[PDB]
Design a protein around this ligand. Sequence first.
Ligand SMILES: CCCCCCCCCCCCOP(=O)([O-])OCC[N+](C)(C)C
Ligand SMILES: CCCCCCCCCCCCOP(=O)([O-])OCC[N+](C)(C)C
Ligand SMILES: CCCCCCCCCCCCOP(=O)([O-])OCC[N+](C)(C)C
Ligand SMILES: CCCCCCCCCCCCOP(=O)([O-])OCC[N+](C)(C)C
Ligand SMILES: CCCCCCCCCCCCOP(=O)([O-])OCC[N+](C)(C)C
Ligand SMILES: CCCCCCCCCCCCOP(=O)([O-])OCC[N+](C)(C)C
Ligand SMILES: CCCCCCCCCCCCOP(=O)([O-])OCC[N+](C)(C)C
Ligand SMILES: CCCCCCCCCCCCOP(=O)([O-])OCC[N+](C)(C)C
Ligand SMILES: CCCCCCCCCCCCOP(=O)([O-])OCC[N+](C)(C)C
Ligand SMILES: CCCCCCCCCCCCOP(=O)([O-])OCC[N+](C)(C)C
Length: 10
Amino acid sequence: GLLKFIKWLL
Ligand SMILES: CCCCCCCCCCCCOP(=O)([O-])OCC[N+](C)(C)C
Ligand SMILES: CCCCCCCCCCCCOP(=O)([O-])OCC[N+](C)(C)C
Ligand SMILES: CCCCCCCCCCCCOP(=O)([O-])OCC[N+](C)(C)C
Ligand SMILES: CCCCCCCCCCCCOP(=O)([O-])OCC[N+](C)(C)C
Ligand SMILES: CCCCCCCCCCCCOP(=O)([O-])OCC[N+](C)(C)C
Ligand SMILES: CCCCCCCCCCCCOP(=O)([O-])OCC[N+](C)(C)C
Ligand SMILES: CCCCCCCCCCCCOP(=O)([O-])OCC[N+](C)(C)C
Ligand SMILES: CCCCCCCCCCCCOP(=O)([O-])OCC[N+](C)(C)C
Ligand SMILES: CCCCCCCCCCCCOP(=O)([O-])OCC[N+](C)(C)C
Ligand SMILES: CCCCCCCCCCCCOP(=O)([O-])OCC[N+](C)(C)C
């Protein structure tokens, strides 16, 4: 979880 949202943010 979580990492996918950060990959979008990046
Ligand atoms: C600054 C913070 C101080 C500490 C406060 C206490 C917070 C404790 C939070 C503990 C949360 C535990 O989540 P979990 O059971 O794995 O739910 C997620 C389940 N899935 C992966 C299936 C979506
Ligand atoms: C704004 C204030 C924020 C404070 C944040 C404090 C965070 C404390 C984190 C404590 C360590 C939690 O490690 P964990 O659940 O085993 O991680 C790995 C999770 N998976 C196994 C699902 C990959
Ligand atoms: C993008 C990733 C998002 C992950 C979100 C994970 C959410 C985990 C939530 C875990 C909540 C389970 O504790 P609860 O029964 O409500 O605890 C009691 C709470 N009080 C002491 C304040 C009454
Ligand atoms: C990036 C985030 C990682 C997860 C960090 C842990 C978050 C834990 C939050 C738990 C908050 C519990 O509060 P409460 O008073 O029982 O509210 C209940 C609110 N609902 C009825 C809408 C569920
Ligand atoms: C404001 C201060 C900010 C400090 C921020 C510190 C960040 C620490 C990050 C610690 C990351 C630990 O990764 P890990 O559990 O081994 O990853 C497992 C990843 N997969 C599930 C994809 C394999
Ligand atoms: C008040 C709310 C503030 C929230 C602040 C959130 C900070 C999040 C920082 C997340 C940093 C994640 O690092 P990472 O790549 O998994 O680290 C492991 C490094 N290697 C890949 C080289 C092993
Ligand atoms: C105890 C520590 C303080 C409380 C921290 C609580 C953090 C909980 C984070 C929960 C994040 C849930 O993401 P969500 O709405 O499903 O994502 C948006 C999805 N769409 C883009 C498709 C609309
Ligand atoms: C008001 C509160 C604001 C809090 C804001 C927190 C933001 C946290 C951002 C965390 C970013 C983590 O980056 P990373 O995974 O190491 O990037 C890797 C990127 N490349 C693969 C291209 C090298
Ligand atoms: C505790 C304080 C919480 C503050 C919460 C602030 C909420 C408002 C965040 C608004 C963020 C807007 O980003 P955006 O232009 O859609 O990003 C797109 C990013 N890429 C171009 C890399 C895809
Ligand atoms: C602090 C400003 C917050 C507001 C940002 C608004 C969205 C702008 C558009 C998205 C910008 C994406 O940048 P990034 O690929 O992650 O850049 C990383 C650059 N360094 C490798 C040099 C650290």
